[PDB]
Write a protein that binds this DNA or RNA. Structure first.
Lengths: 88, 65, 65, 100, 49, 218, 129
RNA sequence: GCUUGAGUCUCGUAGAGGGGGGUAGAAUUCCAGGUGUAGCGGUGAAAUGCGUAGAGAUCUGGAGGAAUACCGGUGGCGAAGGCGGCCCCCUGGACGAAGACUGACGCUCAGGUGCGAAAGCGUGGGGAGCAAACAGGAUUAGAUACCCUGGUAGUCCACGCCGUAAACGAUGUCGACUUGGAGGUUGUGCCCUUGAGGCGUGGCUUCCGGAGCUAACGCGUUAAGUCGACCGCCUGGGGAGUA
C-alpha cells in the first residue's frame, strides 16, 4: 500500500528535497517500495486475480521510467539499483 | 425536506433512538427514501445506523416473534 | 403485523396489517427465485415510473381544443 | 491509536459485578497505551428483541482509542465472557462524546 | 372576498397559487376569469348588488 | 423607454441558448434574453423595413397568437395592409395557387349573402352558408384582396408559427420575425429577438411599424 | 495522442466552421505559424497572433466574406503514416485553380504557386480551399 | 533542451470489485413429544401417490446444505466475464482541489501468455428445494412433450483440463475536434453553504434532436459525424462454420 510514513522518507533519502518527487530515482524506488511491502498481499490468500491488474499497472510503469533513465544516465541507473536494489 | 442528513452534519449514529423510532415503522421495517425525503446516500447511511441497531438490539429486525 | 383496538370495531379490519407489509412476504416466497427477474423488473419497472412525471410536463403545452 | 466505538451488553445477572470489570477493561487500555472518550453506564435498558434467553440487557459504553491488536484481544475477551452476549466495534478516524 | 368579483388575493399571486410570473399579468382562467393584479388596484375594484 | 419597458425579453433558462450567441443572454431570476443585440438591432430594422416599404412590398402581419391577434388587425386594417391573425391554414402561401380559388370561394359567398342566394333557399341551409363564411374569413381576410405575393413579412411568434416561416421560404420571402433563444432563428431576413409574447410588445412594435407603413405608400 | 499537430489544427479549422466561431486557439509552432501566415497572405484566415511568452498560443480569427466560409473544404495531404513526396510537375492544383496546397519546400512553407516560383518541392503539407 | 501528451507524489471519496475465514436471523425436508381431523396435493378436468401403522396443519427444540428482503437507484465496479446482509485481514482500479517535476518515458499488435459465466470429467466432502436417464395417471389416433408425485449426474468449495457463447448499446482500442436540455450517481472551487441554492470543471449511462451519414429504421458529445495510428475479417446462399 506504500505507507505515507515511508514514502516521504524515500523521497527524503533518494530525492534531494522534501518535494522534488517528479524525478527518476523517486518514482521508481517509490513503486519498488510498493512491491517490497506488497509481499504480504500476494503471498497469503493468493487468489486475488483482480489485484493482479493492479500489480500489472505499477510494475510496468516502474520499468518505464527506468526505461528512460537508461537512455539518460547509466551511471545513476546502475547506482539506483545498487543502493535500494530494484533490478532483482 | 429535513435537517437530518443535510444540515445535521457528520453521520447520524443509532445511539440516540429518540429519532430512529421515526425512521423504522413501529414494527421493524424501514421507511422508503421516497416517503421521508432524504438523499439516497444517507438513507443507506441511516441504513448503516439501523443495521447496527439490529446488531446491538436497539432497533430489532421486527416487532415480535 | 398486529392490530388490537379494544372494542369500537365489530369488524375484522385488516387495516394496519395491509399498512405494514402483509403480502410483501408472500409475493417473494411462493414461487421459485429465478436469478434473472430482479435485473429485469427493477429496471423496466422504475423506467415506466419516471414516464408518468415526464407525462406531467409534456401534456400541458398545447392541447388547444 | 485507532478509534473503536465499543458498545457492549452484559447479563442483568452481572449487572453488579461488571462495574468492577469496567475498572478492568479501561485499566487494561491504560496498560496498553490508550485514552477513553466516554465512560458511561446507563443501566439495564430493555432490549429490542429477546436474545435467546432473557430480555432487558445491561448496556455499557466505552468508545475508546486503543490499538486494533488490543481491541482484537478485547473483543475476544468480550465474546469469551459469560456476561457479554453481544459486543461490536466501529471504524477509525471518527469519535463521539454525546451518545445521547 | 372573491378573486373574480374583487381581486387577486396577493400581488399577481393566485389563491390556489397557480399563477406566479409577471408575464401572465392578464391571463384569464377559462373557469375563474381573474386577472392577476396589484392589490392596490383592489381599492378601485368595486362590486355590485 | 427600453422599448416595451424592456424588450430584451425574459426567457426562462429552458431557453436552451444555441441562440446563446445572438443575445449574450443576460438574466433576471427567470432569466432574460438579448440585451444589446436587440436594442441597437431595431433602428437598422426600421431602415430595411422602410425601404422595401416604399418599393411596395406588401407587408403581411402574421400572428396566430390569440391575444395579440387584434394588434395584427390593427396595424393591418387601420392602414390598408394585409394580415393573418388566425389558425394558419396549411397551404395559404404554398398551395395558394388553389387558395386563390378559395378566394373565389370567399369573395363570391360574400356576394351570395348580399344579393345572391341570401333567402332564395330553405332557411335550414341559409344558416350554414353564413356560418362557414365566418370561419374561413377570420384567417383568410388579410390576403383575399392581394394582387400577388407579399415581400415584407412581420412574423410574431416562431415558437408556434414556424411553418408560417417555412412556407414563406417556399418563395424566399424576407422575414422580419421577433424571436427567442429556443425558437427558430435560422432562415430569416431579420431575427429581432427579445420578447415576442407580450401585449405591449406588439403595441409599440406594430406602432413603430404602422408609422413606417404610413410613409412607404407615398 | 492527437498523433498529427496539423490534424489538430485543420480539425479545429473544419469544425471551427462547424461551430462558426471567430477565434480559435491551438498549440503553435514555427510550422503552424508559417502555414497560417500564408493562409493570411491569401485571404483564408484573418490576422493570427502569437500571444504567449514561452507558451505560443496560436490564436486565429476565422474569416468569412459574402456570408460564406472561405476555408470551406480543407484537410491534410502529408499524413504522418503516408508522407507524399511530390516534385514540381506532378504538383496538385486544388479545384483546377480555385484552391491551393500549402507545401513545405526546400526553402520553407509557402503556397505551391510560390514553390513554382522557386522551382523545388517535396512535403506537400495540406490542401486548403 | 522546453511543454499543452502519458504518468508519479502530497491530501481525500462512494461501492453487488475480488480472494480466505467466521458470524446473525429465520425457513423448506426429516426426527421426536402435546392436540386433533378424515381428508391432502393439484389441474381446464382427472389421477398415480399419501393416509386410521393417525399424514397435511399447529407449538418448541435440533443436525445438515444452500441462498441474502424492505433500503434497490437503463444506479455501481470492470478489459471482458461476472457479481447484492455484515464484519475481520490485505489490496487495486476510476476520479478530483491547489502545486512541485522526468520532459513524448506514448498507442496497438500475427505466432504467444493470461482472464474466461455455465457445463462435463478425474479426486476428497456432499445432498434440504429442484432437476437429465426412467417409471406411472392422462389431453390424444400414440407419448419416450406442456402438468403432477419420486429420483441419479449436477447445483456448492478447492486443484487442473476443453479455452466454448446473444463473451451483443450486436457498434474494437487511443487521442483531438463539432450548437443543448430533463435526469440518475459520485467529488470539489467561489459567493451571506444565512436553508435541502447559483455559476464552472471530469468519468459512466438513457431518451428527444442540429451539422453529417444511411437503403431505411435511426446513431447523434458514451456517435453509425470529421481525421490520423494499430489489429482481425468479407467477396451470393446451401455444402459447412463440418470431415
Amino acid at each position: 500500500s506504500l505507507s505515507t510514513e515511508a514514502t516521504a522518507k524515500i523521497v527524503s533519502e533518494f530525492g534531494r528535497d522534501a518535494n522534488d518527487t517528479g524525478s527518476t530515482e523517486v518514482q521508481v524506488a517509490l513503486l519498488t517500495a510498493q512491491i517490497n511491502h506488497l509481499q504480504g498481499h500476494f503471498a497469503e490468500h493468493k487468489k486475488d486475480h483482480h489485484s493482479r491488474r493492479g500489480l500489472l499497472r505499477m510494475v510496468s510503469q516502474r520499468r518505464k521510467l527506468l526505461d528512460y533513465l537508461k537512455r539518460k544516465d547509466v551511471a545513476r541507473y546502475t547506482q539506483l539499483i545498487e543502493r535500494l536494489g530494484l533490478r532483482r | 425536506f429535513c435537517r437530518f442528513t443535510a444540515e445535521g452534519v457528520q453521520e447520524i449514529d443509532y445511539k440516540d433512538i429518540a429519532t430512529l423510532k421515526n425512521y423504522i415503522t413501529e414494527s421493524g421495517k424501514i421507511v422508503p427514501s421516497r416517503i421521508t425525503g432524504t438523499r439516497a446516500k444517507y438513507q443507506r447511511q441511516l441504513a448503516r445506523a439501523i443495521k447496527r441497531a439490529r446488531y446491538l438490539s436497539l432497533l430489532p429486525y421486527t416487532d415480535r416473534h | 403485523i398486529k392490530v388490537r383496538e379494544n372494542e369500537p370495531f365489530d369488524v375484522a379490519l385488516r387495516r394496519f396489517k395491509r399498512s405494514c407489509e402483509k403480502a410483501g412476504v408472500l409475493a417473494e416466497v411462493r414461487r421459485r427465485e429465478f436469478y434473472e427477474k430482479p435485473t429485469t423488473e427493477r429496471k423496466r419497472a422504475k423506467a415506466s415510473a419516471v414516464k408518468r412525471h415526464a407525462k406531467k410536463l409534456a401534456r400541458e403545452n398545447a392541447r388547444r381544443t | 491509536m485507532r478509534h473503536y466505538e465499543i458498545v457492549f451488553m452484559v447479563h442483568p445477572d452481572q449487572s453488579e459485578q461488571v462495574p468492577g470489570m469496567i475498572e478492568r477493561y479501561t485499566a487494561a487500555i491504560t496498560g496498553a497505551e490508550g485514552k477513553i472518550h466516554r465512560l458511561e453506564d446507563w443501566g439495564r435498558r430493555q432490549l429490542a428483541y429477546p436474545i435467546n434467553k432473557l430480555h432487558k440487557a445491561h448496556y455499557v459504553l466505552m468508545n475508546v482509542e486503543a490499538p486494533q491488536e488490543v481491541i482484537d484481544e478485547l473483543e475476544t475477551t468480550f465474546r469469551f465472557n459469560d456476561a457479554v452476549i453481544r459486543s461490536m466495534v466501529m471504524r477509525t478516524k471518527h469519535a463521539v462524546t454525546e451518545a445521547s | 372576498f372573491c378573486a373574480r368579483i374583487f381581486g387577486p388575493v396577493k400581488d399577481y399571486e393566485c389563491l390556489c397559487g397557480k399563477y406566479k410570473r409577471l408575464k401572465h399579468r392578464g391571463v384569464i382562467c377559462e373557469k375563474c376569469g381573474v386577472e392577476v393584479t396589484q392589490t392596490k388596484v383592489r381599492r378601485e375594484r368595486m362590486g355590485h348588488i | 423607454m427600453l422599448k416595451a419597458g424592456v424588450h430584451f425579453g425574459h426567457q426562462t433558462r429552458y431557453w436552451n441558448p444555441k441562440m446563446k450567441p445572438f443575445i449574450f443572454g443576460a438574466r433576471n431570476k427567470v432569466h432574460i434574453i438579448n440585451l444589446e443585440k436587440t436594442v441597437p438591432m431595431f433602428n437598422e430594422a426600421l431602415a430595411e423595413l422602410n425601404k422595401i416599404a416604399s418599393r411596395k412590398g406588401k407587408i403581411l402581419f402574421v400572428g396566430t397568437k390569440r391575444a395579440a391577434s387584434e394588434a395584427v388587425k390593427d396595424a393591418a386594417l387601420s392602414c390598408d395592409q394585409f394580415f393573418v391573425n388566425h389558425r394558419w391554414l396549411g397551404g395559404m402561401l404554398t398551395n395558394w395557387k388553389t387558395v386563390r380559388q378559395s378566394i373565389k370561394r370567399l369573395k363570391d359567398l360574400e356576394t351570395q349573402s348580399q344579393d345572391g342566394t341570401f333567402d332564395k333557399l330553405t332557411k335550414k341551409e341559409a344558416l350554414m352558408r353564413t356560418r362557414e363564411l365566418e370561419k374561413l374569413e377570420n384567417s383568410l381576410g388579410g390576403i383575399k384582396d392581394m394582387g400577388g405575393l407579399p415581400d415584407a413579412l412581420f412574423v410574431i411568434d416562431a415558437d408556434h408559427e414556424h411553418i408560417a416561416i417555412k412556407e414563406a421560404n417556399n418563395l424566399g420571402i424576407p422575414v422580419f420575425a421577433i424571436v427567442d433563444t429556443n425558437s427558430d432563428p435560422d432562415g430569416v431576413d431579420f431575427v429581432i429577438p427579445g420578447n415576442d409574447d407580450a401585449i405591449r410588445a406588439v403595441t409599440l412594435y406594430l406602432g413603430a411599424v404602422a408609422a413606417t407603413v404610413r410613409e412607404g405608400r407615398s | 495522442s492527437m498523433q498529427d499537430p496539423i490534424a489538430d489544427m485543420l480539425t479545429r479549422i473544419r469544425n471551427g466552421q462547424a461551430a462558426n466561431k471567430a477565434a480559435v486557439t491551438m498549440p503553435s509552432s514555427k510550422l503552424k505559424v508559417a502555414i497560417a501566415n500564408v493562409l493570411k497572405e491569401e485571404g483564408f484566415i484573418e490576422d493570427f497572433k502569437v500571444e504567449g511568452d514561452t507558451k505560443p498560443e496560436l490564436e486565429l480569427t476565422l474569416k468569412y466574406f459574402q456570408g460564406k466560409a472561405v476555408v470551406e473544404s480543407i484537410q491534410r495531404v502529408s499524413r504522418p503514416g503516408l508522407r507524399i513526396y511530390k516534385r514540381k510537375d506532378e504538383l496538385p492544383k486544388v479545384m483546377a485553380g480555385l484552391g491551393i496546397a500549402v507545401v513545405s519546400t526546400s526553402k520553407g512553407v509557402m503556397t505551391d504557386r510560390a514553390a513554382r516560383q522557386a522551382g523545388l518541392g517535396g512535403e506537400i503539407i495540406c490542401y486548403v480551399a
